[PDB]
């Protein structure tokens, strides 16, 4: 059976960075080589695996996460990296993490006056655990003597919007990212290459 990578990459609108959606892929035949050799992907970094070999491989099941992020932040989406997005929004594990795919979708995601549909976590109590996801959007005041009592807006707000503009230029452009994870030995294989 063909694999829904077509809808995965061309989903028309990816989820925000903080709320990164997931989708389980199963029983597929994954034509990785025809995907990888495409010219649209600006980067195709892989860890613990090589892209040409991918068809010679065959994992049990694979997950694909998707989010839209800025070019400088794409560098943070790698195993062992640190930074505002890697720490608070989407902590990639300090271990194998499969291929990270990104392309510059500035045409679709950027808009005049700045797209406010995409948001990132400005700060959090502690950095996220690998593949941790949270939707908890509560003002960080903690009340107490240091800041305004809870429910107050004195201590800023947890989320902020990127406001992608064409003017933002090649440095601040919004990239669309998808990342796949491969796990083994815990079950028999169910998807393989062509």
């Amino acid at each position, epitope marked *: 059976n063909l694999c829904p990578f077509g809808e995965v990459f061309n989903a028309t609108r990816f989820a925000s960075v903080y709320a990164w959606n997931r989708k389980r892929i199963s029983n597929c035949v994954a034509d990785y080589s025809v995907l990888y050799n495409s010219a649209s992907f600006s980067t195709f970094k892989c860890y613990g695996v090589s892209p040409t070999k991918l068809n010679d491989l065959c994992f049990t099941n694979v997950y694909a996460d998707s989010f839209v992020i800025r070019g400088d932040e794409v560098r943070q989406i790698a195993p062992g990296q640190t930074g505002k997005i890697a720490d608070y929004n989407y902590k990639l594990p300090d271990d194998f993490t499969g291929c990270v795919i990104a392309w510059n979708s500035n*045409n679709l995601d950027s*808009k*005049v*006056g700045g797209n*406010y549909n995409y948001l990132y976590r400005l700060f959090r109590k502690s950095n996220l655990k690998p593949f941790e996801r949270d939707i908890s959007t509560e003002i960080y005041q903690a009340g107490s003597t240091p800041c305004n009592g809870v429910e107050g807006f004195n201590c800023y707000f947890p989320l902020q919007s990127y406001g992608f503009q*064409p*003017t933002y230029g090649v440095g601040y452009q919004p990239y669309r990212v998808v990342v796949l994870s491969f796990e083994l030995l815990h079950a028999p294989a169910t998807v393989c290459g062509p």
Partner: antibody
Amino acid sequence: QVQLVESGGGVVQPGRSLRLSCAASGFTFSNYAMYWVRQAPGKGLEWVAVISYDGSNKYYADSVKGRFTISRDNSKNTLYLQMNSLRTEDTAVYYCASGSDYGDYLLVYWGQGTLVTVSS
Amino acid sequence: QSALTQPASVSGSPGQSITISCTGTSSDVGGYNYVSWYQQHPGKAPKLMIYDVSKRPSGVSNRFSGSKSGNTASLTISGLQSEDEADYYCNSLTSISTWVFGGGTKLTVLG
């Protein structure tokens, strides 16, 4: 298919205000952007105004900045332009245009502009 | 307004190759690559032909190609069929979030 239609443009005397409407169907009007462009008969094209998907931001050419106002109702797939203190240089054809997946900054789709002239 | 400069008219024999040029400021066509080209036959709404990085929209013949060189960009048309005589305008985005249009070039084919 996508189509746009402009309406309300016509003869007026100088110094008056006038309102133009543009209506779009066939696409998510709320998602992209709307632009206004005018063409004085016998001359090239020049940009008049623009509005953002949410309508929160507006920009205007120096010739019309502050004089004109752009507004939209994303609940009706309808666009509006408000003109004030019209002058003899505003006697052009005005087209409405929107962004698309090719680029929000690109005038992908165009209507069929109305003709407006100020004359005493 | 820093309206872009263009040749007032260009002409070519059917089937030949012809190129239209557009020129602007280092912050009007230099830097950004969003230069786009529009086509307008008389009596009707303009069409577009080229956009960022010379890309071409679906449903338009591959006869049109675009090029950029710093302060200048150009549109080259080949296989003149006499239907391309419609005037062509270049457009680009600028710092301080402003759009500029070229003076428009009228194409005459010796049909």
